């Protein structure tokens, strides 16, 4: 994690870059499988803007195993509380399973942000909740 240094630099805009970098590192520090990615898209009336996001294959445990499921979510600035954009990014050799959590595009359903908002939960807890769901049921179980 040498980019981490350049990361805080790739942002240095967020309300709490430090607090953010600390929240991100914490995540990868808990998983070590995830990786913070950088993205540059337009927003301000169509004006390029730096936006962060987490990506990587989380170690999804099973009844007696632990696979790796890809996930990607956009990290907002600091509102309203957490990033509502949290969807799975499966490959092409996989098989997305439609349900109450997933539709087909691999977009996590439910309000979540408009559910817990204890908040109590944290960036980690967020990816933790999904891991709990992605651990119980197959979010995109692949084939042999």
């Amino acid at each position: 994690a040498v980019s981490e240094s350049q990361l805080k630099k790739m942002v240095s805009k967020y309300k709490y870059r430090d607090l953010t970098v600390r929240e991100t590192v914490n995540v990868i520090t808990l998983y070590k499988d995830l990786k913070p990615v950088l993205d540059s898209y337009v927003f301000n009336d169509g004006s390029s803007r730096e936006l962060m996001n987490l990506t990587g294959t989380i170690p999804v445990p099973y009844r007696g195993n632990t696979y790796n499921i890809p996930i990607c979510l956009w990290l907002l600035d600091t509102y309203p509380y957490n990033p509502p954009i949290c969807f799975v990014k499966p490959t092409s050799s996989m098989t997305i399973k439609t349900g109450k959590h997933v539709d087909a595009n691999g977009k996590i359903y439910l309000p979540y942000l408009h559910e817990w908002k204890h908040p109590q939960s944290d960036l980690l807890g967020l990816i933790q909740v999904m891991i709990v769901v992605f651990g119980d049921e197959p979010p995109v179980f692949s084939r042999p």
């Binding site: 195993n65 499921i69 499966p90 490959t91 050799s93 084939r143």
Partner: peptide, 9 residues
């Protein structure tokens, strides 16, 4: 590590 995802049954 590659994703793939855990299979069913």
């Amino acid at each position: 590590p590659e994703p793939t995802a855990p299979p069913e049954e």
